[PDB]
Design a protein around this ligand. Sequence first.
Ligand SMILES: O=C(O)c1ccccc1O
Ligand SMILES: O=C(O)c1ccccc1O
Lengths: 141, 141
Amino acid sequence: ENRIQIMSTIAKIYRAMSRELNRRLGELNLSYLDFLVLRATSDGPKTMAYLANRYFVTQSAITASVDKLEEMGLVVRVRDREDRRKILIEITEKGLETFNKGIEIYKKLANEVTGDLSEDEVILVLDKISKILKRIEEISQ
Amino acid sequence: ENRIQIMSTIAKIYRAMSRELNRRLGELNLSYLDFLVLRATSDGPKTMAYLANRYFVTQSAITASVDKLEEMGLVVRVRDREDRRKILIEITEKGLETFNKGIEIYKKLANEVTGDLSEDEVILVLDKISKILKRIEEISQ
Ligand SMILES: O=C(O)c1ccccc1O
Ligand SMILES: O=C(O)c1ccccc1O
């Protein structure tokens, strides 16, 4: 039916976008997951547990991505002054610059794929799928 | 902006749905990927190359899923009568029954998450995102 098709189309869109984003972000030496980590830390330091849960990936996956971004000088592991074991992933000046370039790549791709939709159509879809998102997040966790 | 948010929301919806589908399909002894393989073969035999490309996963990932479904008796590797090396993955009677149960689980979840949307709203979203899908598939491959 139509409700199943909306979800299946959302899934197909995600896979195709993922493939293309990995390709375009590649020029910035980033994978889609690496970019997501930068996106998440761009507005404030995040725990590695948050990153794994928010993006539904394994802890080893986050560990690999963070280690990579750290070596690239895009993020740093900040430790509490009294308990060094408490770690937060913080974006660096260079990380923010790279994240910004990544946003432009994302922006350009988004404009291309939604090209057949008018501004009003875009708005109509956005407001309605935001409801779907609220519901699935309430259900899934 | 709005166009970037539509794509980012589509991604967040996909991840949350993936998490929940893996949980609910678990009672059928299937992972989301296993179910997708059944979905793909439900309407006709598919090559392993097609499965990996269509769902954007690695060949080893498809190999593992097919081996599992084969052991579960849900699919079989059919070989050409003159060139046994040419392989197609075909769904079995039992596979179709399991796939059908999987569809009902998907249907129920889809109805829950799109619950705030009227039938007309559902239709409006579906027709518009179908355009987005057409475009990203043209771009990505
Ligand atoms: O990706 C999905 O969740 C899906 C579900 C049903 C039918 C086709 C699909 O791609
Ligand atoms: O998942 C995405 O592609 C995404 C992109 C931009 C901002 C937040 C996001 O989750």
